[PDB]
């Protein structure tokens, strides 16, 4: 003790310096992310920036496929993102064997949360700064979007965004939702959801994206897939002919 | 400030510029909870400007909201609250 | 110190109502204000 | 100013916002009056200085024809009875006579701080300057056609009072340029430099992240130092590829 | 000072602790390694500095194998580099027994990846002062990966680390783009030699010995070999025609 | 010019207006008048405006005194500016 | 090579105070309002569900947890500390009083396990206290209806009404006056809702309000209408609609 | 019949795309005027009116060009008379250049509104 | 038809198209019929979402009943329907019980009838052990007794209520009873007693939040006493505040209330 600048404990202001700084840098990959739910589907659209032309884009991912149905978006630095991915994928696999049943978004969420809170007390071990967005299309509750933060906090969403332009995306989403008074998009076919999502993104970060600048993952009933470059291009093209 | 005190301040700054029929005061009172008159004045003045630049005579419920969101935006941080996390 | 506050607050109610001689009614009303201030925090 | 707004394109969003807040009230008061709202009166710039911030401030003055009036904060403290008071007042007084004019007050943290440990070493002189400033706004001295711009590195010692409109209304930030913005700022900076007939801006733009306008100008000049080395006037796409990666290596 | 110069047990506002920053530096004071991905293979190359006449060629080589098809080369501190491959070898060997398959290159990358990440969340376990460039050919194709002190890895088309990393990458992105990828495994050896040459200008106070290796599907047939003999001499000669610094 | 300040308004009124208008009645009760008032919080929020509104309404002179421009740097002017004001 | 650390993170100070525990007392204060009223005829616990993004939901958040069927618990302090503690507490209650017994745990006895856990984490370095204080409200047939309070140290005390979260003293003071003697469970709900209204401002909805009683166990709460074989829940959360009716009725 | 409806829609999308939100002219405001004039000839008044409004929910090329097109259509209506005077009430109530500033210094905005006053008087 | 939604709808228009009596048959049919979830509330059908809708048919019907002079049927209907709700969910029973005493007094009633309902309601509350709601019902009784001019009877009842609030629940209720007390005394023409009763209301009012209207009623009394003890000048500035508060309230203060205050602002000036 007598230390808080070398080890992690409660602050008397009550705002823990290690948790606050972990809230702050995550953005060191130049990412901005969102996930929304459609009536039947859950779509993630995510930025990609390629900083060299000695790099392939197709090994660059921020979505990791946990199981067959479960997706996870990590917003963070990538050595920490992956560390969580390795751990999450085994715990998911272990659960599936033991309990005969595919891991819930919320349960994965909760379990990684409780562990990070454990590492926060620990004076010899640090917490991961990772912000983990767990998504799927469960059939026992529909579409679900559940977000954790490194603290140990997690809560249920209607749709979510992460990155510094969190506020801008938030507003775009709030406006749509107030108008329909619904917490989802009811558009039949996933396709129309992905395109809408893409429009709102273009508004928020205020730039047109390319095939190699987005990476899109969609969750469907009983299966999860990331979408390819050629398909991503179809989306950008089709909205150019609404006006 | 309490709900009845707040209502006057929104009314008063709005008196001096144009007003809408489509406006509702009722929203403005919920959206600011217990925020000093210095702060409330601040939003309303900003909003009255933002509208004129947007080429509008009347000050709609949407113009008011965007001005509130601009002025409260100072979080470059991802995630907020450590008060209970 | 509070007792002193009560007496001058009472006087301000009579004074407004344009009288120079204070009453029990003013003294209760003044006390009720001072009491609320001690109830804060 | 010394630069125009095409000389520093790729700060776009910030250009568009400043245009509308300073130029436009001069050109029409009329629209703001019919509505009945007051006109904008204040602009704040924060960001690190000479990355694009200083550039904006000059560029705006040029188009309006506005007279740029630079105040050094440590000229407004001098050690005689009543001189500190006079400089700020005189400066505003003349801006109203000769309006439009911009009073650019650099570092309103030396001239309108609010302490942190409540000393008055020379920090009562800080109160004197801040006080004078408020008086003119708060009074019947009339700014509307006379414009004030404050610049301060990080906003941490401005009272809630200034953040109320009719003091500072508009508070402009500095972010880092788009992809689209990098392409635009590169175009202008390698335009003005001599080059091979075939050139690729786009190539550079991908590799660059976390740069600001001053960092993008340096990349233009970095390529050229190696072209003086190579005994020519012509940057190649080949200089630029090196230049951009080196500026990139030396920082985040 | 901030207390995070000697702790790994807490979170820092740079997103990473200063002691991890100190390990990155050590990478930059080693001597140049590259990796060239090809349309049929991968090529590894290294600079080894000669200071003294007493050294013996190709036994003090910093290129080490894992298995028989996986090539690993590193820059920075020698003890950290050996420790790293030695762990990789155990875990690889474990993989080989358990699944009765040769290791994938993306699998090997994880296996190292978790071990390198683990000693940055622990204060009691020292970061690596090496950046290791590795890859081979496997049953998914050929793959070039490069691993950092951070635990950072991504897939490459060309990769570099060590003193001449900047210079080298500059020449490399140009050549890799001008070709489809640096053409075929034979071509790449001459190019590689030219990079090791140019890079020596950043180090020209001491001499070098160029040491090259490969694992190429179509020109070594699935095995890792050092590139030597007639071919290694030939490549220095080719370099000395064009560059004459 | 500013509304919603009901509580501070009432306060000011009894503080400032009433001893000037009705000096006789304090001394007739036999209790102290108020003589000094402190306004604390940020100025220029609508604060200064109430001050100014009473000053005109009672037909009193407004004298705006810069406290911080007494801050002169010798024995000369400043301590004598205080006498005269 | 690690796990050799066990020096404490809670030490004595020169006022003989405990450093972490002072720090944690704040954390409770920065929480939101939660209360408990024991009517003798039951127990009512209520809290504000609040959330940290407008896009989040507090309808799909929970701040009352079931510990065992007949017992529910609520807190003021930090969200992370509460989740790990509830999990560990749910574990020991099953293992040690339904494998060694079969009757669901008496309340007080469950409080003693939660207290032991929290104090254990304060003694031993490499863990720190949990930053939370609970009101664990239950029912048991041999005790009747019960209410316990657990402090962040690990200390406990019984209370027949108490309040925690912002304006703690003042909320509790309000209860003393409005409720005396023994009054109904129903009536105590009407009161609890009012008390919770005065603490909070800017949310008044039943989708941000959670009120639960321990006061009846129905076949409807048993999940079967057959002949009983276990006690089942005595815990019941009142609906968002149900909450809304009663706010109108103040 | 259909051919003219397509010609108005197909040319509109190309016109907005040619203009962009960057410049005043890049549209030929000839195509805009040409389109509007073709439509009035093409179909009945209730149809013309519906279309001209639906187009205005977009950018509409400029605030001045919209006002020019509105004002031409307005004269044709007043000319046609009978039940059509009634239909002008609808057109004037939908648009927001006569009731909200967009660049309201035009003589024409005000003038349409004067006609609406005359219809109301009767 | 044979549908809860259709038959609510039909019934509502049916008053207007034809008569109240044709509509009334529909309305009773709804009570009597339509199977819904859980326990009954009409005894022959089961009801919960229907019983909620039935409350809106009850208010509409109750409006018509006061004009018809089925006021007497209304008086019976309200106590009788307490036990209807009693059988299912408790929460519904609270809300509906308080709302119904208000529904009757919302529209013009016979006083004798109005009183008879209030006493029985207090009795239904007694069976249980609620006292939250029951302190409230006694206010309504006091107010009615006063209007009838059985001023002693109001005085006795108000005294007991006063003692309950100063050691038990409902702080806001206190303010309303002080004002009412003043009205009891003022009319009896005892100026002293009302004037102190009013000080007590003012004190109370500012302790705590009170509704816009409750305060605004307080200034109306303050204006009244300053006309009876003279100085109209000050009485006007009070009617001015009351009149502003009523304006922003819109039609949520009564037509007739708004009218009396406008009358008093005009009147005050003529006296001055």
Of D135, D160, D161, the CB nearest to F66: D135
Q: Which two tokens stand for residue E240?
A: 């000395």
Do residues D246 and A86 lie in contact, with contact meaning Cβ atoms separated by under 8 Å?
A: no
Q: Which residue of G has its CA nearest to E118?
A: G1
Residue I243 in contact with residue I223, Cβ under 8 Å? no
Structure token pair of residue E51 = 């200071």
Query: Which helix (DSSP H) or strand (DSSP E) does residue I172 occupy?
Result: none
Q: Using CB atoms, list chains with 3+ pairs below 8 Å to chain D.
A: A, B, E, F, H
Beta sheet of A63-65, edge-to-edge order: A63-65, A71-75, A131-137, A143-148, A154-156
Give the DSSP per-residue string, E34-60.
EEEE-SSEEEEEEEEEE-STT--TTSS
Residues of chain D contacting A207 with CB distance shorter than 8 Å = 178-180
Query: CB F29 to CB C14 under 8 A?
Result: yes
Give CA–CA dist D170/D152, Å, rounded: 14
CB–CB contact A75 B73 (8 Å): no
The Cα E188–Cα E220 span in angstroms is 14
Chain D residues near any Cβ of chain E (below 8 Å):
238, 241-242, 245-246, 249
The DSSP secondary-structure symbol of G104 reads P
**Which residues in chain F touch residue B11, judged by CB atoms under 8 angstroms apart?**
3
Q: How long, in residues, is chain A?
A: 243
Interface contact flag, G1 E123, Cβ < 8 Å: no
Separation of alpha carbons A10 and A19, rounded Å: 11
Architecture of domain A2-242: 4-Layer Sandwich (3.60)
Helix ranges, D139-200 (H): 160-163, 179-191
Q: Is I226 in contact with I235 (CB distance < 8 Å)? A: yes
The verdict on whether residue D166 carries a ligand-binding annotation is: no
Q: List the CATH code of the domain at G1-249.
A: 3.60.20.10
Look at residues G164, G195, G166 and name the one whose alpha carbon lies nearest to residue G178.
Answer: G195
Distance CA E103, CA A194 (A): 37
Structural domains of chain E, count: 1
Distance CA(E60)–CA(I236), nearest Å, equals: 105
Q: Is there a contact between B49 and D34 if contact means CB atoms under 8 Å apart?
A: no
Closest chain A residue by Cα to residue B71: A167
Distance CA I221, CA I223 (A): 5
Residue I231 CA to residue I124 CA, distance in Å, equals 49
Contact present, G63 and G46 (Cβ < 8 Å): no
Euclidean distance between CA atoms H113 and H36, whole angstroms: 21
DSSP state of G145: E
- DSSP3 helix / strand / coil % (chain E, rounded to 5): 40, 30, 35
Give which of D72, D214, D64 is closest to D146, Cα–Cα: D64
Token pair for residue E29?
A: 């004071």
- Among D138, D79, D143, D148, smallest CA distance to D108 is for D148
3-state SS class at B74? coil
Q: C15: which chain F residues are within 8 Å (Cβ-Cβ)?
A: 18, 22, 25-26, 29
What value, to the nearest 5°, has the Cα angle with vertex A183 and ends A181 and A186?
Answer: 90
D31 close to H (CB below 8 A):
yes
* Residue numbers in B near D38 (CB within 8 A): 45, 48
DSSP E123: S
Q: Please calculate the CA angle A217-A219-A224 and round it to the nearest 5 degrees.
A: 85
Rg (CA), chain F: 16
Give D21's DSSP letter.
I
Q: Which resolution, in Å, applies to this structure?
A: 7.7
Tracing tokens 């080589």 back to the chain, one arrives at: E61
Tell me the C-alpha distance between A78 and A55, whole Å.
15
- Quote the CA–CA distance of E150 and D165 in Å, as a whole number: 47
How are strands ordered across the β-sheet holding D147-151? D67-71, D101-106, D147-151, D42-45, D170-172
Q: Closest approach of chain G CAs to the CA of E126, in angstroms?
A: 10
Q: Which backbone phi and psi does A129 adopt, to 5 degrees?
A: -90, -5
Binding site annotation covers F43?
Answer: yes
CB-CB neighbours of I35 under 10 Å: 10
Token pair in block for residue C12: 């301000």
Instruction: List strand residue ranges (DSSP E) for G78-143, in order.
Output: 132-140
Is F4 in contact with B37 (Cβ distance < 8 A)? yes
Half-sphere CA count of G132, side-chain side, radius 13 A: 28
Find chain I residues with C-beta within 8 A of G187's C-beta.
Answer: 128-132
- Provide the sign of the torsion angle of the four alpha carbons C2, C7, C12, C13, taken in this order: positive
Chain G CB contacts of B80 under 8 Å are 52-53
> For the domain that residue E100 is a member of, what is the CATH number?
3.60.20.10
DSSP collapsed to 3 states, D164-179: CCCCCCEEECCCCCCH
3-state secondary structure C3-41: HHHHHHHHHHHHHHCCCCCCCHHHHHHHHHHHHHHHCCC
D53 annotated ligand binder: yes
CA A78 – CA E153 distance, rounded (Å): 8
The CA distance from G38 to A39, in Å, is 44
Mark yes or no for CB contact D249/E173 under 8 Å. Answer: no
Size of interface G-I (CB pairs under 8 A): 50
CA-wise closest residue to E215 among E114, E143, E154, E152: E143
The strand pair at A214-220 and D147-151 is best described as: unpaired
Report residue I210 as tokens: 């009170």
Cis upstream peptide for A101 (omega within 30°): no
Tokens of I30: 């709804």
Strand locations in B1-85 (E):
none
Look at strands A223-227 and A143-148 and give their pairing.
Answer: unpaired
Residue pair H60/H22 in contact by the 8 Å Cβ criterion: no
Cα→Cα distances I182→F23, G106, I172, Å: 35, 55, 17
Find where tokens 């990080």 sit: D154
For residues G31 and E155, the answer to whether their CB atoms sit within 8 Å is no
F78 is known to lie in a ligand binding site: no
Q: Identify residues of C whose CB sits under 8 angstroms from chain F CBs.
A: 7-8, 11-12, 14-16, 18, 20-22
Q: Which of B79, D181, D169, B26 is nearest to A170 (CA)?
A: B79
CA distance G57 to G54: 7
In whole angstroms, give the CA distance from residue F36 to residue F46: 20
| Residues of D within an 8 Å Cβ radius of F | 79-82, 85, 124-125, 127-128, 131-132, 134-135, 137-139, 159-161, 164, 167
Instruction: Say whether E225 sits in a helix, a strand or coil.
Output: strand
H or E element in which residue G98 lies: none
Residue B22, number of CB atoms within 10 A of its CB: 10
How far CA G242 is from CA of D144, E28, G247, G249, I97, in Å, comes to 56, 68, 9, 11, 15
Helices (H), ranges, H20-82: 29-42, 45-56, 63-80
What whole-number distance in Å separates Cα of residue D186 and Cα of residue E145?
Answer: 32
Within 10 A of G175 (CB to CB), how many other CB atoms are there? 20
Q: Are the C-beta atoms of B17 and B48 separated by less than 8 Å?
A: yes
**A157 vs G57: CB contact, 8 Å cut-off?**
yes
CA distance D143 to D94: 12
Question: At G38, is the secondary structure helix, strand, or coil?
Answer: strand
Instruction: Single out the residue of I64, H66, G53, G100 nearest to residue A162, CA to CA.
Output: G53
Answer whether E47's CB lies under 8 Å from E200's CB. Answer: yes
Rounded CA-CA distance H10/H33 in Å is 15
Q: List all chains that touch chain F, counting a touch as 3 or more CB pairs closer than 8 Å.
A: B, C, D
CA distance H111 to H98: 9
Beta-sheet pairing, D147-151 with D42-45: parallel
Is D219 in contact with D207 (CB distance < 8 Å)? no
Active centre residues of E (catalytic):
31
Distance CA D212, CA D193 (A): 19
CA distance I225 to A202: 67
Q: Touching A: which chains, 3+ CB pairs < 8 A?
A: B, D, E, G, H
Residues A157 and G57: beta-carbon distance below 8 Å: yes
Run of H or E residues at D97: helix D84-97
Q: Cα–Cα distance between D216 and D244 in angstroms, integer? A: 8
Strand, helix or coil for residue H38? helix
Cβ contacts from A onto D, under 8 A: 19
Question: What is the length of chain G?
Answer: 250
What residue in A sits closest to G121 (Cα-Cα)?
A121
On whether D171 is known to bind a ligand per the annotation, the reply is no
The reply to whether residue F22 touches residue C11, judged by beta carbons under 8 angstroms, is: no
E99: contact with G, CB 8 A cutoff: no
- Are the C-beta atoms of residues I202 and C29 closer than 8 Å to each other? yes
* DSSP result, I29-47: HHHH----SSSBSSSSSB-
User: Does the beta-carbon distance from C11 to F18 stay under 8 Å?
Assistant: no
Which of A25, A54, A123 is the closest to E156 by Cβ?
A: A54
Q: Which domain holds residue E167?
A: 2-244
Q: Report the Cα I100 to chain-centroid distance in Å.
A: 9
Q: Is D246 annotated as a binding residue?
A: no
CB spacing of B1 vs F5 below 8 angstroms: no
Query: How far apart, in whole angstroms, are the C-alpha atoms of residue I146 and residue I194?
Result: 14
How many Cβ atoms are within 10 Å of A177's Cβ, its own excluded? 17
| Chain E CB contacts of G1 below 8 Å | 124-125
Among candidate residues G114, G50, C40, G136, the one with its CA nearest the CA of residue B83: G50
Longest dimension (CA), chain G: 64
Q: Which two tokens stand for residue H74?
A: 């307005």
In degrees rounded to 5, what are phi and psi of residue G45?
-125, 140
Experimental method: cryo-EM
- Minimal-distance CA residue of chain B relative to A75: B78
CA distance linking residue A111 with residue A87, whole number of Å? 11
> Is there a contact between F64 and D139 if contact means CB atoms under 8 Å apart?
yes
Q: What is the 3-state secondary structure (H, E, C) of chain A?
A: CCCCCCCCCCCCCCCCHHHHHHHHCCCCCCCCEEEEECCCCEEEEEECCCCCCCECCCCCCCEEECCCCCEEEEECCHHHHHHHHHHHHHHHHHHHHHCCCCCCHHHHHHHHHHHHHHHHHCCCECCCCCEEEEEEECCCCCEEEEEECCCCCEEEECCEEECCCHHHHHHHHHHHHHHHCCCCCCCCCHHHHHHHHHHHHHHHCCCCCCCCCEEEEEEECCEEEEECHHHHHHHHHHHHHCC
G37, G192 contact by CB (below 8 A): yes
Give D241's contacts in chain E (Cβ within 8 Å).
170, 173-174
Neighbours of chain C (3+ CB pairs under 8 A): F, I
DSSP state of G163: E
3-state secondary structure G214-250: ECCCCHHHCCCCCCCCCCCCCEEEECHHHHHHHHHCC
Closest partner residue to F68 (CB to CB) among D128, D138, D164 is D128
Domain ranges of chain A: 2-242
Q: Pull the structure tokens for residue C30.
A: 């003044």
E strand or H helix that includes residue D101: strand D101-106
Are the CB atoms for E157 and A55 separated by under 8 Å?
yes
Ramachandran bin of D115, using left for φ above 0, alpha for ψ from -120 to 50, beta for the remaining angles: left
H58 contacts in A (CB within 8 Å)?
Answer: 243
**How many CB atoms lie under 10 A from the CB of residue A96?**
15
Q: F45 vs D161: CB contact, 8 Å cut-off?
A: yes
Q: In chain G, count of helices (H) and strands (E)?
A: 6, 10
């Amino acid at each position: 003790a007598g230390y808080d600048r070398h080890i992690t404990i409660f602050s008397p202001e009550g705002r823990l310096y290690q948790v606050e700084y972990a809230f702050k840098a995550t953005n060191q990959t130049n990412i901005n992310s969102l996930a929304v739910r459609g009536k039947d589907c859950t779509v993630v659209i995510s930025q990609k920036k390629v900083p060299d032309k000695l790099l392939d884009p197709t090994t660059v991912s921020y979505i990791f496929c946990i199981s067959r149905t479960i997706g996870m978006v990590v917003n963070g630095p990538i050595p920490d993102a992956r560390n969580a991915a390795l751990r999450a994928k085994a715990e998911a696999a272990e659960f599936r064997y033991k309990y005969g049943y595919d891991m819930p978004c919320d349960v994965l969420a909760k379990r990684m949360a409780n562990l990070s809170q454990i590492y926060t007390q620990r004076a010899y071990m640090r917490p991961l700064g990772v912000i983990l967005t767990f998504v799927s299309v469960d059939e026992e509750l529909g579409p679900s979007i559940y977000k954790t933060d490194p603290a140990g906090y997690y809560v249920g969403y209607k749709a979510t965004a992460t990155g510094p332009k969190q506020q801008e995306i938030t507003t775009n989403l709030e406006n749509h939702f107030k108008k329909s008074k619904i917490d989802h998009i009811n558009e039949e076919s996933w396709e129309k959801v992905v395109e809408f999502a893409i429009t709102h993104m273009i508004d928020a970060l205020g730039t047109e994206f390319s095939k190699n600048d987005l990476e899109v993952g969609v969750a469907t009933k009983d299966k999860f897939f990331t979408l390819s470059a050629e398909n991503i291009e179809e989306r950008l093209v089709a909205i150019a002919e609404q006006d | 400030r309490d709900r009845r005190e707040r209502r006057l301040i929104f009314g008063t700054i709005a008196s001096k510029m144009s007003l809408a029929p489509e406006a509702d005061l009722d929203s403005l009172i919920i959206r600011n909870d217990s925020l000093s008159g210095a702060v409330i004045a601040a939003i309303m003045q900003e909003a009255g400007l933002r509208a004129v630049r947007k080429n509008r005579y009347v000050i709609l419920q949407s113009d008011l909201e965007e001005a509130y969101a601009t002025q409260v935006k100072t979080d470059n941080t991802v995630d907020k609250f450590d008060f209970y996390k | 110190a509070d007792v002193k506050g009560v007496c001058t607050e009472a006087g301000m109610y009579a004074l407004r109502e344009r009288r120079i001689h204070v009453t029990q009614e003013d003294f209760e009303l003044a006390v009720g204000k001072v009491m609320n201030k001690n109830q804060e925090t | 100013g010394e630069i125009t707004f095409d000389g520093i394109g790729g700060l776009t969003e910030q250009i568009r916002e400043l245009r509308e807040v300073i130029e436009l009230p001069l050109k029409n008061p009329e629209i703001f009056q019919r509505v009945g709202i007051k006109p904008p009166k204040g602009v704040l710039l924060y960001g690190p200085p000479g990355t694009g911030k200083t550039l904006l401030a000059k560029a705006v003055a040029a188009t309006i024809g506005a007279n740029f009036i630079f105040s050094p904060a440590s000229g407004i403290v001098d050690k005689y009875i009543g001189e500190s008071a006079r400089i700020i007042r005189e400066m505003f007084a003349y801006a109203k006579e000769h309006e439009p004019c911009i009073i650019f007050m650099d570092e309103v943290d030396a001239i309108g701080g609010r302490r942190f440990s409540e000393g008055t070493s020379a920090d009562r002189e800080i109160q004197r300057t801040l006080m004078e400033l408020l008086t003119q706004m708060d009074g019947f001295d009339n700014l509307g056609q006379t414009k004030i711009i404050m610049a301060t590195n990080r906003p941490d010692t401005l009272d809630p009072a200034l953040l109320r409109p009719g003091r500072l209304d508009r508070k402009v930030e500095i972010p880092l340029p788009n992809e689209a913005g990098r392409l635009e700022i590169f175009k202008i900076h390698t335009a003005k430099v001599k080059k091979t007939g075939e050139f690729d801006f786009e190539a550079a733009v991908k590799m660059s992240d976390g740069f600001n306008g001053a960092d993008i100008r340096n990349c233009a000049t970095e390529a050229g130092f190696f072209a003086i080395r190579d005994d020519r006037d012509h940057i190649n796409p080949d200089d630029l590829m090196k230049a951009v990666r080196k500026v990139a290596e030396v920082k985040k | 000072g901030t207390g995070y110069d000697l702790s790994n047990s807490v979170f820092s506002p740079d997103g990473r602790n200063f002691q991890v920053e100190y390990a990155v530096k050590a990478v930059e004071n080693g001597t140049t390694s590259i990796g060239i991905k090809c349309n049929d293979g991968v090529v590894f190359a290294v600079e080894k500095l000669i200071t003294s006449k007493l050294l013996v060629p190709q036994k003090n080589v910093k290129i080490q194998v894992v298995d028989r098809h996986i090539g690993c080369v590193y820059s920075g501190l020698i003890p950290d580099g050996r420790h790293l491959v030695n762990r990789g070898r155990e875990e690889a060997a474990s993989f080989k027994k358990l699944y009765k398959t040769p290791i994938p290159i993306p699998a090997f990358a994880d296996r190292l990846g978790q071990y390198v990440q683990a000693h940055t969340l622990y204060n009691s376990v020292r970061p690596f002062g090496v950046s290791t460039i590795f890859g081979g050919v496997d049953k998914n194709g050929a793959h070039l990966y490069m691993l950092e002190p951070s635990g950072s890895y991504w897939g490459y088309k060309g990769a570099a680390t060590g003193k001449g990393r900047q210079s080298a990458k500059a020449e490399l992105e140009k050549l890799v783009d001008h070709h489809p990828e640096g053409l075929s495994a034979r071509e790449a050896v001459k190019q590689a030699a030219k990079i090791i040459y140019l890079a020596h200008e950043d180090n020209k106070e001491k001499d070098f010995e160029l040491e090259i290796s490969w694992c190429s599907l179509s020109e070594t047939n699935g095995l890792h070999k050092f590139v030597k003999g007639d071919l290694l001499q030939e490549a220095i000669d080719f370099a000395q025609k064009e560059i004459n610094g | 010019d500013v509304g919603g300040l009901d509580m501070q308004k009432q306060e000011i009124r009894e503080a400032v207006e009433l001893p000037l208008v009705q000096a006789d009645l304090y001394e007739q009760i036999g209790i102290d008048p108020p003589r000094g008032v402190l306004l604390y919080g940020p100025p220029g929020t609508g604060k200064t405006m109430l001050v100014k509104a009473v000053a005109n309404s009672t037909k009193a002179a407004f004298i705006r005194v810069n406290g911080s421009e007494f801050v002169h740097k010798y024995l000369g002017e400043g301590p004598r500016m205080v006498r005269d004001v | 090579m690690t796990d050799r650390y066990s020096f404490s993170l809670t030490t004595f100070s020169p006022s003989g105070k405990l450093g972490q525990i002072d720090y944690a007392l704040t954390a409770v204060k920065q929480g939101v309002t939660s209360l408990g009223i024991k009517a003798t005829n039951g127990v009512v616990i209520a809290t504000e569900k609040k959330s940290s993004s407008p896009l989040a939901m507090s309808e799909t958040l929970s701040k009352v947890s079931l510990l065992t069927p007949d017992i529910g618990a609520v807190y003021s302090g930090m969200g992370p500390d509460y989740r790990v503690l509830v999990d560990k507490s749910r574990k020991v209650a099953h293992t040690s009083y339904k494998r060694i017994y079969g009757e669901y745990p008496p309340t007080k006895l469950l409080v003693s396990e939660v207290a032991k856990i929290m104090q254990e984490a304060t003694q031993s370095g490499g863990v720190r206290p949990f930053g939370v204080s609970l009101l664990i409200a239950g029912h048991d047939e041999f005790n009747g209806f019960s209410l316990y309070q657990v402090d962040p140290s690990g200390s406990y005390f019984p209370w027949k009404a108490t309040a925690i979260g912002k304006g703690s003293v003042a909320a509790k003071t309000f209860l003393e006056k409005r409720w005396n003697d023994e009054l109904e469970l129903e009536d105590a709900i009407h009161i609890a809702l009012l008390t919770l209204k005065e603490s909070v401002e800017g949310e008044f909805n039943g989708d941000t309000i959670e009120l639960a009683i321990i006061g009846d166990e129905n076949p409807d709460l048993l999940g079967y209408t057959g002949i009983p074989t276990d006690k089942g829940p005595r815990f019941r959360k009142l609906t968002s609609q149900e909450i809304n009716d009663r706010l109108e009725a103040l | 019949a259909q051919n003219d409806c397509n010609s108005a829609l197909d040319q509109l999308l190309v016109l907005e795309k040619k203009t962009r939100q960057a410049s005043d002219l890049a549209s030929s405001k000839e195509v805009l005027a040409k389109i509007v004039d073709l439509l009035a000839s093409r179909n009945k008044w209730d149809d013309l009116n519906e279309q001209l409004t639906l187009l205005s929910k977009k950018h509409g090329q400029l605030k001045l060009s919209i006002q020019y097109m509105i004002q031409k259509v307005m004269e044709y209506l007043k000319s046609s008379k009978s039940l059509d005077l009634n239909t002008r009430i609808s057109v004037i109530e939908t648009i927001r250049v006569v009731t909200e500033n967009k660049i309201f210094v035009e003589v024409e905005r005000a003038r349409v509104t004067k006609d609406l006053v005359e219809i109301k008087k009767e | 038809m044979s549908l809860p939604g259709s038959k609510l709808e039909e019934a509502r228009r049916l008053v207007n198209e034809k008569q109240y009596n044709e509509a009334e048959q529909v309305y009773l049919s709804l009570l009597d019929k339509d199977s819904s979830q859980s326990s009954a509330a009409a005894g022959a059908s089961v009801d919960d979402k229907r019983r909620n809708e039935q409350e809106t048919s009850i208010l509409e019907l109750g409006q018509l009943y006061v004009t018809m002079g089925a006021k007497d049927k209304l008086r019976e209907f309200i106590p009788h329907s307490t036990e209807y709700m009693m059988q299912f969910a408790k929460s519904k029973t609270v809300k509906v019980l308080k709302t119904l005493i208000e529904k009757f007094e919302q529209v013009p009633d016979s006083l004798d009838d109005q009183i008879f309902v209030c006493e029985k309601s207090i009795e239904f509350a007694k069976r249980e052990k609620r006292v939250f709601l029951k302190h409230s019902l006694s206010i309504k009784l006091a107010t009615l007794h006063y209007q009838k001019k059985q001023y002693k009877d109001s005085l006795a009842l108000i005294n007991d209520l006063l003692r309950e609030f100063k050691k038990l629940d409902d702080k806001p209720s206190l303010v309303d009873v002080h004002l009412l007390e003043s009205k009891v005394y003022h009319k009896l023409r005892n100026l002293a007693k009302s004037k102190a009763s009013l000080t007590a209301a003012r004190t109370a009012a500012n302790s705590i939040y009170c509704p816009t209207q409750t305060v605004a009623e307080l200034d109306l009394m303050s204006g009244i006493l300053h006309c009876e003890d003279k100085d109209y000048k000050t009485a006007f500035s009070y009617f001015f505040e009351s009149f502003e508060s009523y304006h922003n309230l819109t039609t949520h203060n009564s037509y007739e209330k708004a009218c009396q205050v406008l009358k008093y602002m005009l009147l005050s000036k003529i006296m001055l």
